Swiss-Prot record, chains A, D:
Domain of life the protein comes from: Eukaryota
Lineage of origin: Eukaryota, Metazoa, Chordata, Craniata, Vertebrata
Full protein segment contained here: 90 to 110 of 110
Coiled coil: none
Disulfide topology: 6-11
Natural source organism: Homo sapiens
Protein name: Insulin A chain
Length: 21, 29, 29, 21
């Protein structure tokens, strides 16, 4: 999930944007 | 700013800034 | 802190702080 | 919606908590 991908590993724009509505 | 470790309130802030008027869903699981 | 005008990033921050591990959905419409 | 209830008018805990998952 998001904390895994973006906090304990490095985040990216593509992944952030997957959480937009 | 998005290509780094983003945890806690920094993550929510990154999503706010990126998703704009869309909004977003935050599930830290 | 929640019984006030909360706009922009302050609103998202209020929701982060209140919903904790649940997370939340933000749709500013 | 949320901006209406909590930004242009005064927010409350009950309303914030309606947006939690």
């Amino acid at each position: 999930g998001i904390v895994e991908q973006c906090c304990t590993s490095i985040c990216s724009l593509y992944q952030l944007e997957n959480y937009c509505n | 700013f998005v290509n780094q470790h983003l945890c806690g309130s920094h993550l929510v802030e990154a999503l706010y800034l990126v998703c704009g008027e869309r909004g977003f869903f935050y599930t830290p699981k």
